[PDB]
Amino acid sequence: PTVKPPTARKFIWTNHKFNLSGTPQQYVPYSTTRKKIQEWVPPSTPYK
Amino acid sequence: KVSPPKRAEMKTSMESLIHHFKLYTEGYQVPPGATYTAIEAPKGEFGVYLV
Amino acid sequence: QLITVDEKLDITTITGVPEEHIKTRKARIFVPARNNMQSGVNNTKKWKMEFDTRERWENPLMGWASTADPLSNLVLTFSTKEDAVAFAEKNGWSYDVEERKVPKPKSKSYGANFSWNKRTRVSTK
Amino acid sequence: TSVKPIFSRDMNEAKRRVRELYRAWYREVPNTVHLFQLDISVKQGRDKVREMFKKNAHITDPRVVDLLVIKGKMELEETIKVWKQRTHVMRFFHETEAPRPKDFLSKFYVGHDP
Amino acid sequence: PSGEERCIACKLCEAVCPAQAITIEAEPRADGSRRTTRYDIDMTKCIYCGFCQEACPVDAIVEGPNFEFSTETHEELLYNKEKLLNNGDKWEAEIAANIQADYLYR
Amino acid sequence: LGLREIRIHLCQRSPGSQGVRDFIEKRYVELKKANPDLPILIRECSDVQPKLWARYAFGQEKNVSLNNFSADQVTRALENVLSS
Amino acid sequence: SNLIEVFVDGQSVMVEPGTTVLQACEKVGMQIPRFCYHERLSVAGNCRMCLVEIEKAPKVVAACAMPVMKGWNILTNSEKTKKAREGVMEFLLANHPLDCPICDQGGECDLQDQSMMFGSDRSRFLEGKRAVEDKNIGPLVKTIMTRCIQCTRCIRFASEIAGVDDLGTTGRGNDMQVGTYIEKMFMSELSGNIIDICPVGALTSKPYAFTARPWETRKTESIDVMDAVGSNIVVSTRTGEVMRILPRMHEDINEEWISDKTRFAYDGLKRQRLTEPMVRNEKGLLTHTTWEDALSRVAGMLQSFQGNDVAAIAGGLVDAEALIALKDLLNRVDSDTLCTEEVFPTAGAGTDLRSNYLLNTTIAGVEEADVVLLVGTNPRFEAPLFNARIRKSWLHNDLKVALIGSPVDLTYRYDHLGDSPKILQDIASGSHPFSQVLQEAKKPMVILGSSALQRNDGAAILAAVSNIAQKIRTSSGVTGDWKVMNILHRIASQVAALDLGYKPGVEAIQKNPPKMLFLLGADGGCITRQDLPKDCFIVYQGHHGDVGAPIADVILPGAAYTEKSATYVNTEGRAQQTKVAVTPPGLAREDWKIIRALSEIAGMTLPYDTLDQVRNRLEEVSPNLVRYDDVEGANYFQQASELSKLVNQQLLADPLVPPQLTIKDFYMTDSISRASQTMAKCVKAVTE
Amino acid sequence: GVRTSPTGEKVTHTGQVYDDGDYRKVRFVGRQKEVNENFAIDLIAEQPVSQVGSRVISCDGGGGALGHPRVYINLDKETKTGTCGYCGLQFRQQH
Amino acid sequence: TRPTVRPRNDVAHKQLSAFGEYVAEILPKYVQQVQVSCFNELEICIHPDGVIPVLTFLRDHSNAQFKSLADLTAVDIPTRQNRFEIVYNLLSLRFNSRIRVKTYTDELTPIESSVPVYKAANWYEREIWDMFGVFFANHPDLRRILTDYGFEGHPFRKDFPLSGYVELRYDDEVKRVVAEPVELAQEFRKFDLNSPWEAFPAYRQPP
């Protein structure tokens, strides 16, 4: 890379990170989608 | 209709993009039939009976 | 030498299926309806057997669709309704058969588009 | 209705094969418990054998009975020669599976399965 | 180069994946763009065959040059879209150069 | 413990339902006049055995076969239910 | 007799005269390629993809438009035919955009699939492509018109099926553009069908946009419950979620179309859902609880009440399995106040005779009628696919249509006789000139909408309309087997309710207000707490929190129609069944199982524990309810007319005005459509 | 951009965030929630609209055969800009 | 010689056809159909009673000499009343030729074990029994070969589910591996791939 540096992009990490497994920085999977079914919320007033 | 187009053709030609799309989703159809085909594999005769 | 066996064919005990997936299941024997998004009719030739849909739920870790139904993806193809019904009976599945729906023959006439006195006259082409 | 037999020509001949298989399983249970060092008793093992024979008591097709006996002999051979391991023997007892109540209400509370 | 995602949720990679390792959901983005809301790769299902990157029409999903990412838990190998995008931002300098060297054989 | 509902099932064309078809065509209008508040549900279905169903209080039901019944036998059968 | 012999690749086939070359190939099982041709639209012959060689003819013919001639041999696979398909396909793809990855049609595209089968495998077009601007035609159909291949299917469908002459072509040559020229929305009740018939991704569904690919969806064949037509549908699901609704071909019901409410209201199934049993706490607020706690509270009240103290109202989306289960449960406390929200006059025969409340001519029968008399109804919105069938007969058989009621727009011209209900008496007595038309007709059809029986003089209007139909039949000139009198229903659950013996309307509940009320998905607002004793115990079973749930003492979450296998009887009396596409959400349960579970806890166990057994119960009460897809005939109109004359009623001086006058009233008519955000967009679009 | 819920959990570019009372956020305790900070919807909006002199312009995303399939964009409407459906670059026809 | 098209070898097609009717003439008691595909493979379809006579003749006859059993497999076609098609692929070193012999059976009908003809057939028949449940009469030692001990069912049947009915895990309470009903965190996603447009007119079936 001294002779042929890589093409710069503004979204490329400026700071490389090594393998973070086993540490508090480890990746934890999760679902990236929002809740699919919306539940009816009952009224807050008494009327019955 | 069997082998996918080159990527540069896939990105310029309408027919190539269609065929790339279909080959990588449905895949090519194979005419009905059955074959036993064998080769001289390193361990001996290796064959498939493909229907 | 051939022997006479007069009972109905019932292989439920030698197929290895669990009991809950013989008596609780409902097989549907049908010809798939044409996908309305396309005009081709080649997916309406053969009969199909499918089973009732059971629960799918979200995986707590990833949100994937989990199932406990081993027959959820099982689809069988048959040449005729009779073949599908015979297969269901010998396996012990209760089934619903649905008649094949064939498109009705139509009277098409290009010349009707320009009728002298009828309503079939088109206003544009 | 003229079909090629497997072994038995009729249910009377088939039931004889069943009885011989039952004797072989009945005799073997004490050996299975001792060899595999199971923590069930010979009575439990023999009750289970009886349970497996009972579930097929309604068969009236000699060919189906013949195939059930053939598989029974294969299963017995796997056990006698210790091809099966303790895990395979104990799978008949479903020890780790929780009861699923069969009443309408109990199913109704837990899910949509009939 | 602008920073917009290349993936337009065509699901060709998901369709071709021999292992069914890819899971995708998509919807119109708030600006109307055709973009994914889910893009998971189960790295314990994946067979690292590269069919997904062959199938991708826009060079969105790639197999990069990293092979040193073993983990201490199974769950750490279930990648979601955030992980995969971070991988792209982490490795883009090498990935772009590797694609430059080989795209004329593709 | 009284009567609550009467249901008559029959085929539109089978000869076994001819007497019931006659009874409806002839005597049903007068039956409904006598019991204006009594649901008498006549339900035709192809290739069914004709039957008379009576529902009494608290959901007790009994059915009576009208197969190959004359219009007179049908009248008697209904009379038993309306009475007994 | 007049069949002429032709040959397809040397194989003889006998066809009626007028059969096209395309139709002749169908008879031997060969499907000629096509784009512009649709068998339910007028022949266009502009795409040229159907070109086929006739043996010994130097020029290939358009198979979709050319009638066959005796002795012709059609070479569907000749090199001449193949080279024609490649040429046309190459012209179709010259200017077509490289959009498949971002195009919703990808995977179920006729252009893709026929390019694969009939086109070449590469391109020799070395120019720049055409680009066309897109056009807004409402919130339901997205237009990416650069993908349009100018097949004119949308134009023909809009004119001929939907009866709307807004779509057309502007310009000419390569710059010819499909659209509306001006800015206009295509908001017909049948508008969504142009998504299906458009062969490419030019017209797609906005709600569905980008959400799925065709290969990954599972297809559940089911029945629509948004109306009483009973349209056959396919429910597309993926990974446990409903993705879209498509039509399913049924010649005798919906052909291959569905209404916009059928197509686009499914998104109301993801909102305002009941997912957990609820009871009232100590402050009078609804609180989540278990099925055990919730059913015990209901069972306790059910055990302390009898007779008239207990009633039930079934709503519009209730299935027959739940209907009979709830009837059996109430009958076991000696209650018979089983009511529906949708009124039907009980005078005379009432619901004793099926012919009294059925579309006896059937939907397909409209094609054989020569006069139709529509009374007090707006079939366009009440039953869009039945109205489409009338326009089909109007267009193709020169059917004469007259309407007594408001002068609504039915997408075809009709004779508006006025709106006064008294006009019916004039027709019956011969004073009105239209009485001559009915006598002359060989197959008249009088259709009385259920909307008009919701008035207070409904029995009078039914008696008047029935009187008209009696005079026609009596005076002869109508074949014996032809049925004349019809009722057009708008509620999915109505006919199964009347078949099982439910009382139509809540009039019974108004006379003797109960102490315990079961609201079985009843969200019309017919009964509120103003009409009930102050301490009335109200149990709501349903799938949406809409109108009935907020006033209930107990909420039992049930399954929507996409989530159960349930029986629905359409306006012809034809029974059909849905299938489970996805399971109910949360703690929701199948509806007849809730009632069956309640019966056990209350000690009145119903005698059926499976779906098949409860369907055996349906057979004991009305045997037609298990004859799926069969239209069981109903007779004895003479007896019904006799009993209808006994008690005379006065017609009201109020003109017949249907509930739905314009499109804006069509989109939200039930709990599911009211919860649909897409249906809310449509209402906004047609009122702003 | 990347917001935080009232609980402090970052909201992703897909809008995901566990609501309070969702037990599943326990999976982040002692660890972290992987969130990509470069929101593509924000990045693309930063691009300037390109002015062109023709009614139709083509976009391949840049880089020749390293971009996306080449598409042609109509610029006849002055009520808005033409947007590439693959990459989101905007174009306008000048006068 | 079009570069992308497989060439035709007409000499082989003629040779295999001639030998095809040669076998039909000699064993008419059993042979039901003889065909040669467009890629020159000869198939003999026989009544199952002729498994031993036909295979013995092909192995031993001086004009056949099919000494090697290359492969013995089964195919499940549920729409047939005899759902299982048994396929013998044989090789002749003397004449440098291959031949396929096919027969049929159902769930309850035994097929004669061909071990007396080809010792290779021993394990192939065990596999067919294991994966399809076809019983071979007079097999020296017929038992499962591929599936787990005590496994229930025949996985290669079309109606056996892809993921089976039971799965395994280690249970700490009983200190052993146990079997339980199968639940998948991610259900297999069924894809509907077939295009609704016919691909090969040459194979169209009559309506």
Ligand code: SF4
């Ligand atoms: S490399 Fe992995 S994710 Fe990509 S197609 Fe192959 S198995 Fe699927």
Ligand code: SF4
């Ligand atoms: S990564 Fe590529 S192939 Fe996969 S969905 Fe996105 S654009 Fe399509």
Ligand code: SF4
């Ligand atoms: S209409 Fe068909 S061919 Fe055209 S871009 Fe869409 S999927 Fe591709």
Ligand code: SF4
């Ligand atoms: S929009 Fe679709 S249906 Fe209409 S002319 Fe264009 S391709 Fe045909």
Ligand code: FES
């Ligand atoms: S299908 Fe005949 S020209 Fe279009």
Ligand SMILES: [K+]
């Ligand atoms: K379309």
Ligand SMILES: [Zn+2]
């Ligand atoms: Zn671009």
